[PDB]
Design a protein around this ligand. Sequence first.
Ligand SMILES: [Mg+2]
Ligand SMILES: [Mg+2]
Ligand SMILES: [Mg+2]
Ligand SMILES: [Mg+2]
Ligand SMILES: [Mg+2]
Ligand SMILES: [Mg+2]
Ligand SMILES: [Mg+2]
Ligand SMILES: [Mg+2]
Ligand SMILES: [Mg+2]
Ligand SMILES: [Mg+2]
Ligand SMILES: [Mg+2]
Ligand SMILES: [Mg+2]
Ligand SMILES: [Mg+2]
Ligand SMILES: [Mg+2]
Ligand SMILES: [Mg+2]
Ligand SMILES: [Mg+2]
Ligand SMILES: [Mg+2]
Ligand SMILES: [Mg+2]
Ligand SMILES: [Mg+2]
Ligand SMILES: [Mg+2]
Ligand SMILES: [Mg+2]
Ligand SMILES: [Mg+2]
Ligand SMILES: [Mg+2]
Ligand SMILES: [Mg+2]
Ligand SMILES: [Mg+2]
Ligand SMILES: [Mg+2]
Ligand SMILES: [Mg+2]
Ligand SMILES: [Mg+2]
Ligand SMILES: [Mg+2]
Ligand SMILES: [Mg+2]
Ligand SMILES: [Mg+2]
Ligand SMILES: [Mg+2]
Ligand SMILES: [Mg+2]
Ligand SMILES: [Mg+2]
Ligand SMILES: [Mg+2]
Ligand SMILES: [Mg+2]
Ligand SMILES: [Mg+2]
Ligand SMILES: [Mg+2]
Ligand SMILES: [Mg+2]
Ligand SMILES: [Mg+2]
Ligand SMILES: [Mg+2]
Ligand SMILES: [Mg+2]
Ligand SMILES: [Mg+2]
Ligand SMILES: [Mg+2]
Ligand SMILES: [Mg+2]
Ligand SMILES: [Mg+2]
Ligand SMILES: [Mg+2]
Ligand SMILES: [Mg+2]
Ligand SMILES: [Mg+2]
Ligand SMILES: [Mg+2]
Ligand SMILES: [Mg+2]
Ligand SMILES: [Mg+2]
Ligand SMILES: [Mg+2]
Ligand SMILES: [Mg+2]
Ligand SMILES: [Mg+2]
Ligand SMILES: [Mg+2]
Ligand SMILES: [Mg+2]
Ligand SMILES: [Mg+2]
Ligand SMILES: [Mg+2]
Ligand SMILES: [Mg+2]
Ligand SMILES: [Mg+2]
Ligand SMILES: [Mg+2]
Ligand SMILES: [Mg+2]
Lengths: 213, 121, 112, 116, 54
Amino acid sequence: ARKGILGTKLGMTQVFDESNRVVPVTVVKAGPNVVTRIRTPERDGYSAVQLAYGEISPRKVNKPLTGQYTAAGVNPRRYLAELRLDDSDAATEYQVGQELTAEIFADGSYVDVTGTSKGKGFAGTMKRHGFRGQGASHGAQAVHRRPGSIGGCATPARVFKGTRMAGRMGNDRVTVLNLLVHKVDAENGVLLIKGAVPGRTGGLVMVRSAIKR
Amino acid sequence: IQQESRLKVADNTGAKEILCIRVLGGSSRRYAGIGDVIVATVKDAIPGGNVKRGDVVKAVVVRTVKERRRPDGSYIKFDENAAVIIKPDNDPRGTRIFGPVGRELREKRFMKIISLAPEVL
Amino acid sequence: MNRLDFVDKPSLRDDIPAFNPGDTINVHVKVIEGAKERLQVFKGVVIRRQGGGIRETFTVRKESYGVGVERTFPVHSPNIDHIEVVTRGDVRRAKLYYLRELRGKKAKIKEK
Amino acid sequence: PKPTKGPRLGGSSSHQKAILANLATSLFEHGRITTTEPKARALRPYAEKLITHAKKGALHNRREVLKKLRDKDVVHTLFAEIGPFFADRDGGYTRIIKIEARKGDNAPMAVIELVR
Amino acid sequence: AVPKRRKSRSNTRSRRSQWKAAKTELVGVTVAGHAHKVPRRLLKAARLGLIDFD
RNA sequence: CAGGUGGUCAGGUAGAGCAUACCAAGGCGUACGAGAUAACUAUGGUUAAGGAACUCGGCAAAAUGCCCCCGUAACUUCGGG
RNA sequence: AAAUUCCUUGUCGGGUAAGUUCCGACCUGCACGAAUGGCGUAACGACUUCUCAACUGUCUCAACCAUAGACUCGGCGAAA
RNA sequence: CUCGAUGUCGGCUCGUCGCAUCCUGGGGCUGGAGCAGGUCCCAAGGGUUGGGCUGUUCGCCCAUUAAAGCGGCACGCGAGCUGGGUUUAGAACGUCGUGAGACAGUUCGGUCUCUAUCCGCCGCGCGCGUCAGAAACUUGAGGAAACCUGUCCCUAGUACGAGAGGACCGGGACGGACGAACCUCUGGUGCACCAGUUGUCCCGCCAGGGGCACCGCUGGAUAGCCACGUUCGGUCAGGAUAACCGCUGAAAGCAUCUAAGCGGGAAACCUUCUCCAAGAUCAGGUUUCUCACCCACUUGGUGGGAUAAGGCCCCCCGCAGAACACGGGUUCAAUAGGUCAGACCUGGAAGCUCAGUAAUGGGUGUAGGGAACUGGUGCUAACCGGCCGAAAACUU
Ligand SMILES: [Mg+2]
Ligand SMILES: [Mg+2]
Ligand SMILES: [Mg+2]
Ligand SMILES: [Mg+2]
Ligand SMILES: [Mg+2]
Ligand SMILES: [Mg+2]
Ligand SMILES: [Mg+2]
Ligand SMILES: [Mg+2]
Ligand SMILES: [Mg+2]
Ligand SMILES: [Mg+2]
Ligand SMILES: [Mg+2]
Ligand SMILES: [Mg+2]
Ligand SMILES: [Mg+2]
Ligand SMILES: [Mg+2]
Ligand SMILES: [Mg+2]
Ligand SMILES: [Mg+2]
Ligand SMILES: [Mg+2]
Ligand SMILES: [Mg+2]
Ligand SMILES: [Mg+2]
Ligand SMILES: [Mg+2]
Ligand SMILES: [Mg+2]
Ligand SMILES: [Mg+2]
Ligand SMILES: [Mg+2]
Ligand SMILES: [Mg+2]
Ligand SMILES: [Mg+2]
Ligand SMILES: [Mg+2]
Ligand SMILES: [Mg+2]
Ligand SMILES: [Mg+2]
Ligand SMILES: [Mg+2]
Ligand SMILES: [Mg+2]
Ligand SMILES: [Mg+2]
Ligand SMILES: [Mg+2]
Ligand SMILES: [Mg+2]
Ligand SMILES: [Mg+2]
Ligand SMILES: [Mg+2]
Ligand SMILES: [Mg+2]
Ligand SMILES: [Mg+2]
Ligand SMILES: [Mg+2]
Ligand SMILES: [Mg+2]
Ligand SMILES: [Mg+2]
Ligand SMILES: [Mg+2]
Ligand SMILES: [Mg+2]
Ligand SMILES: [Mg+2]
Ligand SMILES: [Mg+2]
Ligand SMILES: [Mg+2]
Ligand SMILES: [Mg+2]
Ligand SMILES: [Mg+2]
Ligand SMILES: [Mg+2]
Ligand SMILES: [Mg+2]
Ligand SMILES: [Mg+2]
Ligand SMILES: [Mg+2]
Ligand SMILES: [Mg+2]
Ligand SMILES: [Mg+2]
Ligand SMILES: [Mg+2]
Ligand SMILES: [Mg+2]
Ligand SMILES: [Mg+2]
Ligand SMILES: [Mg+2]
Ligand SMILES: [Mg+2]
Ligand SMILES: [Mg+2]
Ligand SMILES: [Mg+2]
Ligand SMILES: [Mg+2]
Ligand SMILES: [Mg+2]
Ligand SMILES: [Mg+2]
């Protein structure tokens, strides 16, 4: 039931629908994928399928990975990821070496898009966690963006684990739910997905048929 | 438009300037746009008129300086913020409107104001 | 050229006349009032073009009843039925934002 | 060219303008300059664009170069020799070579020079 | 804030031992018939004679 | 050692001016440097719509600001304001 | 009802959408009062206090930029 | 306990916990017709507004709301901020004292220090381990985050009710607050962009430009970053239950939800959704690659040396970034720069010429200038290279 594809975020644009309403879309080049591997419950303990996406010079792949691809009889690709299926294999619907193109999805369906969000570096509490800070005037001394108190007093004489402080922000795995597929352009292998998609332009993206729908 | 914003009254009830007390529409609602109901107080009134300085009224915003996006991707924007004082049944207390108003009142069901307005953009 | 030109090209429009900021323009906008679908006209002065092909917008300004109004449309919007050029302006800028605080004679654009 | 990301050279950017112009003048006058590696890396595209103007070599190009440079001798030599010398080369007019750092602050050094 | 207590020898030495110079790697160069070693980033300068081997 | 120290001289263009800006004569670049788009602190800058809702308090900032010409209230000790 | 009034945010009026502060009064002056001066007063105040116009990052509610630190490398090298 | 010092009210910032529950959720009784309510039981998942006055906590008032909960944590929180009050030295009023002075009486004024050693917390690395050395993809023990709610319409003016009024249960639409991602739009910013302009100095002068004056000022402004912007989310369904409601049914020929046994039952709990995670020392799994030598010796699960697969350092960079790390590239190369062409920003360059006494205007000409985005181009630099890195057995 669960359908998946791997692609690249190509940036956003806008289109007008039939109601003459503007629709902001993200162009995802859901390029062709190869299966390259099937996980069976009998052999691995769960049911899933690998997917190979992206072109790469064969000289850029080391001998072990090249051997893994040769075992599947497929030319090496840049990326490799597993699509997890329900705990029932059904022992069907996928063959090693089979091609997956963009029209596994249809117009008007909903998808889940997971990617790697943009990095923000070391971030303060005001950006990272939406703290308020103290005022800009009325005597405040060098605390305009500082966090304030971080605990109680002699009880407990510690800071609780999971207290929100400054640190590295971004580069996370992020899934956006219930995105409407506005158009499936099978000619260019392009999905026009209404909304925003995590990550930078040119980053690896996994598109899955939505489960909440 | 938020609390403490001052508005120009766009009808002939006798008030010239109201001050926004509350933006109706839920707990801690922040801003009001075109078609939003407002609890206001009269700050300037025409001498010898219906309303008086210090009266608490209800009004609907019909013009706003900040541009509004429309579902087709267009935007509308006026030069001033304006409001129309209304009765509890969403009908104006005055007898005529001055200046243009936005289409959002049509969807917010202010048909009487829509019909009395000189122009609806 | 851009990366998404192939996505954008089957959505651009034609029949759109060439106009610059400072020109007086008639815009015929489709309007839905119940189930009627008439056609309204906005006559004004183009004060801004913000390029980008399909995502390009333009802004027209007019004074309606002692109040100034500005509409920003997407060029290539299908709700625009057509656009008519009434006058060509003669301006030295691209954004004409100084008209936002001029009324009467002082808010007048030359005619060349 | 592409603006500097991060703090500018020599403090402010009004100083960076002058630093780049002086480095360009010295480079065109001598053919070869020794300086810190960041300064040479920042100088490379800046000097290549002036060489391109000299290759075009019209009065407008000369005025545009005189906008940045103030040494008329160097402007003359750039428009008479360096331009015509590079007339048959499509970019890459300069070359950067890394050198041993200097005592005092251990600043990394490099030399920048025209290709011939 | 001031140190509440003096650090033990072990604790001082653990932190002190991590202050150390990184060693650069050297490659062979034959200039003017003689063989030397320079850091790899200075190969061009060595071959062009811009390196002073003292 | 960013503090203190009496007197004399004192150019140009703009300016009412010994203010201020840019310069002359004449001095000087003053004694750790080189890099690098972290948070945060400091010192400056800009900010849609609103406009004191901030706060003990309009604190701080913003604002006004010049020459010429009109015109100018209560009150007054007749000068003022 | 005060630089004096505890009770007390007295009470009445004004100002505000809403005023323990403010202004005008009442007199029930805990505990005013005539050179330790009483009551007024134009002008004046980096005084205290209340209100308005204008203006604004004070705020709704923050965002971005540059420089000096912070950070990295080389040198010197403290302190409680 | 603390006097060789444990900073005192209120506000701010950041919280965390309890439940004696304010709302939302579930129930019994009712002096519950319906709508509304009263009271008690269960329930802590989330939510719980903005202002006027006062130093205030408290309180009153104004406008809303589903609601505007009560408490603990040194009356949480000053090596996090403030300093209005209280509680130093000045001064005044009232009262008390002969006086010096006093006053839980009032009133104006009145320095808020510290470079983080340890634990703690937020991030990021280096080392070793995981019985050969490596590369890719993974399972999930166990955790973290999240959890809010309104109005309108249909059912239906139906049930109920003399009338007034007016539903339960189900089904839709549109919102508010909050959060995450993103830059297409709108808006902000913009210190190597474009234009205009004041003062002065300079480029010999004219013309054309440049330095400095907050980026001198003013008008715009692609990229990046952003919210005031755009999209999405808090769901459906199971499981075990709370109060409560039962079925069958004795002890105790009746009855009884209970003693045997079986059901229904909530935002609480557990799966389900999102994220972390094998240092999970029980150190997991599926695969693929190397799969090989030499010397010395006390012949050792011994020390060295040299390799393979594979890395690392160096080099060219990044929308990755404090260092580090991460990702890409290294001539079999479009990685950065240059260069050519676009997109976009600005707005009509210089020179020449024509018109005008001149300031200026028209033509040449959608001109010229230009950063970030896209594509071509082998011109410059990615080099003529170093450092690490593979196995006693044995038992069944
Ligand atoms: Mg703030
Ligand atoms: Mg202070
Ligand atoms: Mg300080
Ligand atoms: Mg400060
Ligand atoms: Mg403890
Ligand atoms: Mg344009
Ligand atoms: Mg920048
Ligand atoms: Mg520095
Ligand atoms: Mg300057
Ligand atoms: Mg001195
Ligand atoms: Mg002078
Ligand atoms: Mg001076
Ligand atoms: Mg000077
Ligand atoms: Mg740094
Ligand atoms: Mg503003
Ligand atoms: Mg503004
Ligand atoms: Mg005010
Ligand atoms: Mg206030
Ligand atoms: Mg407040
Ligand atoms: Mg001030
Ligand atoms: Mg100022
Ligand atoms: Mg009295
Ligand atoms: Mg008294
Ligand atoms: Mg009183
Ligand atoms: Mg007030
Ligand atoms: Mg006040
Ligand atoms: Mg009084
Ligand atoms: Mg007395
Ligand atoms: Mg006496
Ligand atoms: Mg008196
Ligand atoms: Mg005085
Ligand atoms: Mg004074
Ligand atoms: Mg050092
Ligand atoms: Mg004590
Ligand atoms: Mg002690
Ligand atoms: Mg309870
Ligand atoms: Mg009940
Ligand atoms: Mg009843
Ligand atoms: Mg709760
Ligand atoms: Mg739960
Ligand atoms: Mg609490
Ligand atoms: Mg306390
Ligand atoms: Mg303190
Ligand atoms: Mg305190
Ligand atoms: Mg403390
Ligand atoms: Mg402490
Ligand atoms: Mg005080
Ligand atoms: Mg005293
Ligand atoms: Mg006495
Ligand atoms: Mg005081
Ligand atoms: Mg688990
Ligand atoms: Mg975010
Ligand atoms: Mg963009
Ligand atoms: Mg914009
Ligand atoms: Mg420039
Ligand atoms: Mg000048
Ligand atoms: Mg001149
Ligand atoms: Mg100068
Ligand atoms: Mg932008
Ligand atoms: Mg029974
Ligand atoms: Mg553990
Ligand atoms: Mg690498
Ligand atoms: Mg020209």
